[model samples]
Target: GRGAAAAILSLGNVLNYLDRYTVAGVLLDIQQHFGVKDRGAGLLQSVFICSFMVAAPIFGYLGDRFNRKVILSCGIFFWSAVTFSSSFIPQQYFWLLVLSRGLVGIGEASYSTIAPTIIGDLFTKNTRTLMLSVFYFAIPLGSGLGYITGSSVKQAAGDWHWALRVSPVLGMITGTLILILVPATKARTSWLRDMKALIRNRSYVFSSLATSAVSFATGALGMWIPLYLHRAQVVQKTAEGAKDSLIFGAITCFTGFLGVVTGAGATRWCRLKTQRADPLVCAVGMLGSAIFICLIFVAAKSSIVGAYICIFVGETLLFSNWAITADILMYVVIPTRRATAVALQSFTSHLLGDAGSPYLIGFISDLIRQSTKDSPLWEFLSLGYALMLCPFVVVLGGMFFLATALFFVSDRARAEQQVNQ
Candidate 1:
């Protein structure tokens, strides 16, 4: 039953990300349908993540104090309703589309902040580490699937609206499973008390900062890569968006599997040599990821194949830190505050990371385009210039991990001591 519970939670996550990235997969179509520019296109995601981050803390609070399964189930059901109904919105009502994304974000916040804490209550130690990796693996798995399904359905039906309709069926099914399958554990603490303590905890602070960097890069890259590649003219314009999204999705699936497995294995082996292996692994991964991610733009101008190679390696290195980061919070923060910890972490990451990253990249890309003559070259160059920021922020995240490494052991011991007392 416990193992079953973890699987259900993972599926819920798979559905969560699948729904999120489906929009990304059909982004070009959405752009043309709405007749919007790059900045406005990004505002769709900004609106979504903005509402998501704001709701994360609220869900975290409620998760710690209430029936988590019921809340999670309701959130999924709400998400399905929004997703399905949103497809019916007419072309002129793009505002409704943005609003629907915001509603979906609130639903996602319920699951994202609370699911790991639920898993944390069930397992601790190696098994906990293993479970977390499996759970986190669902992220890329679903993201890849979202892209494939989104584009494939659109191609098959010759209508972009069908892509949005595809997932809610699975969403409804998954929501029902959450009610039937997921078990609940509970928590209670003053919000301000938890908030104050989390702030004072140096590891939590640094880790959240690092997570924001990850979120920023991921959000910006995920939304823009297909269009960026298309602009590079590496693929024909006719079916290029779908084609790029498909291949990128396939790569994300494989690399995500590879990265998490590599991360978990490396951290476990490294732990024998260094107690601070978790943060160190993250540091090295992010630093190395920056190298390949930067190479992607350079490669794109010449060889799309070379660019794909860069993405494969870069995403592998970047994604390698996913499970390890989750494990970091589990080690450094006590269980009583873990829900709040995850929520606030999500809050900060979104507020500082993804909430604006997509829009910022788009805004900057558009700003750069305005300065130069309008040509395909400038269009591609301007986007590439703006995307350069991701690598620098990634470098900053590596240093944050370095700082988190220094504090990890003491914070870990203190949390363990709290449990004992």
Candidate 2:
């Protein structure tokens, strides 16, 4: 049953992510069509996340207080309609395109925050991490599909609007199917009371922040890197410009796929070996990710090989946090309030992390471009923001501190698990 739910949720995630990444894959066309710089292009992702961050609490509360399936279906339908509407946007009205993406973000927040809670209900501790990993695998696959489909749709139709329009249509169909097929469950606690209690939990606060920090860096990078490779790496570019798009798109999709698969595997491997200390492995991966961020950006500024290696390594390290985060949340929360707990996690993370980073990057990029238009400095500013993603290491450091400080309080819950063992 959990597997069945995962299949459905994964499909939703696939389409939802496809909504975001299709824009990335078509960055050059979108930029050219809109007559905007990299900063303007980057604002698209920022807008989506910002919309998502704002809507998280409402959907999360609905998940806790009402039917998650109903709330999710509503979100999916709303976003899908918005996505469809985006296609009709005139090429010149780029802000409208960003607005449409932002609408997708609002629906995305509902599905993302609430899906895990439903997953938690259907699966047990023994199976949850594996299931969550399975769900998250959709990230790379959807992203890859987004690139392939975006390029293909544009190539076939000679317009990026079709690329923007397809996933949301699929999402609308899928969401409607889920609503009819998936049954809703009753909440165990009042939403208000649970949220208040959840916020007071020290472990939740730290783990969510730690997770968000990692996500903010990667999420923003994930939005921009495909564009970066095409523009920044001369070797990627060719006489036709087609060569760069094909090669770099293939590389990004393939490498990103491996990264998610390997990251998930690494988390499980560490868990089997260390049991209680599993999060330590995740922490180590984040630290390694930070190191790779420096290596790739600094080196890529000089050499193509350095950039490619960093891309692969950075994705591997970055995705590992998914497992770490799931483990922390499940270990800390009661089964009954899990949905609300997950909602709060999504709320804080997006509010502080991914939602804010893109806009911040956009603002900074715009600021830099105002001073140095059409120069390497504009590109460097974007890379510098990408590099700033490394601050996730500091977030990881705080995770350790929080873990140590709250161990005694949270350890009591873990001790109960010995009975089942």
Candidate 3:
């Protein structure tokens, strides 16, 4: 059951990311198809993420109190259907596509809120981070596919439709497979009861805020980095320059995967010796992430290689502590309210973190582009990194508080485990 659940969760995550990445890959095509500017395209992403945030609590409640298998299977199928249906949309019906993306978000909210809860059911505390780490590897791999295939394959295929069409078909097949193979767990409690139980947990609240900070910063960087590279080319179009852009992209993908592995592995290793170890691990990752953000921006202006290395390490720090932090939140919340807790975490993170990052970056870029048409490229690239300090400073503050709080909380929770129950 553990192995099966892990497989299902990982594959589900793959599909979850496929839908997201495909949109990103063909973003330019979608924009062209709809005759929209960068800000408009950003708004589409914001709409999708915002809908995801709105739907999470409702679905999270349902998943906790009702049938986990049915909810998971339904979400998978619904989103897959939406993904496939999205390809058939006519260029003039851009609003329809955005609406479909919103529906996709709703389906995804169900999956995201429930999958970890299922994983928690199947695994022990000792194995939770490891299991989640394995599942999260899908993120970078799927994202890389989104970037590489969306750009290169679409170019070769001579249309964006092929790029758009293949992903949803993949989603459909995977959704069906998950429905057939993944085992269903019995429901835990009444939805109303679970929501109330979840809100009372202080640890869940702290971890949610910490994760939200990471999500916002990472989301902003992910949304704008590609555009940043493209803008850089307008002023200095050299073969070596194009190579540097590809290098940045490659570093972003490879380093992100490595970062996840490193963070998870180190945190788990430390936790074996002591409980306070996990926060120390997370704090280190937060520090690395902030440092890299500043370095990457400075490097982009000075040394391309330095920028690539910094972004690679930066993403590594950002994503590496993710599963550990999530695992902590899950363990702190009661078993009956786990789904709701996770759902609230998702909603909060997206709302506070990613929902508007892309749109804001796009708006800022356009503002800079209009003012400095002659050097629009450099101006635009610089603008994205200008606010690097927001994520850097915010995460630094949050993680420090988290680390200190965990020292006391983990000790108290460890001692009062039976009494708390």
Candidate 4:
């Protein structure tokens, strides 16, 4: 029964990221169609993320007090309808697309905070980590498919709007499956009490901050990397402009799967040696990814193959932290308060992380372009410099995770005691 629940929730997880990234794959096309600048194009995503962060606390409040199955199904249905509605909106009214995407974020906020908490309630500590691994595994897989679907559909149909149709259809099916398969569960704590307890938890606070830093880097890089690779004269020679989306997306899927599996396995192994394994593993992954990301810039300046190799390595290391960090949050807070914890984590991570990073990168990239307008290499130089912000932020995230390791054992014990009480 738990397996079936995980499967259903994972399917929803897949559609969640798939819908989010499909727009990214067609960003260049959208830019051209709407005649929007890079910053304007980035703003569409920023709006979605900001709306998501804003709605997360509200959903978190409800998720901790209501029936999760009902909340989850409603969210899935809401996003699916909004995504389907987007396909009919003409390109001339791009702001409508932006508004639709923001609405979609509200739908997603309901699922993102509550689903994992349900998973936490369904399993023991070790099993919960594995299940969470399975759940987050959907992120890259769906994102990869989103890239493929968005680009391939546009390529075949010769219409970017058609790409938006795929997720909604899948989402509707997933929403129904979730409604039927997942059991309904009631909340265990008041919103005020949950919030107060979570805020006092040092491990949760640091872990959320660490996650935010990674989110900031991922948001900026994920939004622009395909565009970056597409623009690189060397990469374009081999993969054409939009075609790079498929290649990068495929690499993300492959490496992300391997990374999560490896990270989960390694984390389990390390747990035998030390209780600090969760945060320790995350720290190593973030720091290692930071090093590889810097190498990516160097390699991109040299050869396309070299850049791709670095991307695969860096992404694998970066993804290694996904499951363990989530597992940390689940264990550091009691099951009764898990939904609220997840929601608060989401709020902090996105409010400071993805919500602003993409737009900031786009805004900075435009500034660089304007400053170097007269230069022959303005396009190349501006984007390259703008992306340099990613690795530095990732390193800071590593440090934060390392600090969390120091406090995790105490926090976990406190949470366990609260549950027993």
Each model's lDDT comes to 0.88, 0.69, 0.69, 0.85
- lDDT ranking from best to worst? 1, 4, 3, 2
Cα shift from native, residue 69, model 1 (Å) = 4.3
lDDT of 4 by residue, 159-192 (tens): 8878888669989999989978777552244877
Identify the candidate with maximal lDDT: 1
Worst 10 residues of 2 by lDDT: 235-244
Which scores greater on TM-score, model 1 or model 2? 1
Write one digit per residue (lDDT tens) for candidate 2, span 34-94: 8987668778887887887787777767787787888888888988898789888776677
Measured against the true structure, the TM-scores of the candidates, in listed sequence, are 0.88, 0.78, 0.80, 0.86
Candidate 3 C-alpha lDDT tens digits along 259-280 = 7678779977988887766666
Runs in model 2 with CA error above 4 Å?
1-9, 63-74, 113-133, 179-203, 234-276, 301-305, 332-340, 376-421
Better of 3 and 4 by lDDT: 4
Candidate 4 global CA lDDT score: 0.85
Model with the higher lDDT, candidate 1 or 4 = 1
Q: Name every residue pair that clashes in candidate 2.
A: none
- Cα RMSDs of all predictions? 3.2, 4.7, 4.3, 3.6
Clashing pairs in 1: none
Q: Which residue runs does candidate 4 get wrong by more than 4 Å?
A: 1-8, 63-71, 114-133, 176-201, 234-239, 272-275, 330-340, 374-376, 406-421
Rank the models by TM-score, top first: 1, 4, 3, 2
**Residue-level error in angstroms, candidate 4, position 286:** 1.4
